[PDB]
Amino acid sequence: MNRQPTLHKASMMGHKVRVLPNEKTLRLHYANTGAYNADFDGDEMNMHF
DNA sequence: TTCAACTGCTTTCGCATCCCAACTACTTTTCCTCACACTTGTACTCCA
């Protein structure tokens, strides 16, 4: 996963997949928001498989 | 041993002259409806 302005290497980390029903967006824990410089207000993140 | 032009670089996704037409004219397409000049007898007397 990476938040797109990739300033440091902790903004591109390896997550484990958890497939959640009934949902239409990617869905992330709060403990990961400091490393991506992320606030949940319309930000997007790319998911490479 | 220096002045002055030629020099590539600021970000990170996604957003975002020729033609046509107007109106009024004039004209052609033809088909239909009759007249205008010519002529022999007959009629009314004509001169024999």
Nucleotide with smallest C1' distance to residue A44 CA: B13
Experimental resolution (Å): 2.7
Asked whether residue A4's C-beta has any atom of DNA/RNA strand B within 7 A, the reply is yes
CB A31 within 8 A of CB A7: no
At a CB cut-off of 8 Å and minimum separation 6, what does A49 contact?
none
Give chain B positions with protein CB within 7 A.
Answer: 12-13
CB A40 within 8 A of CB A7: no
How many other C-beta atoms lie within 10 A of the C-beta of residue A47? 10
What was the elucidation method?
cryo-EM
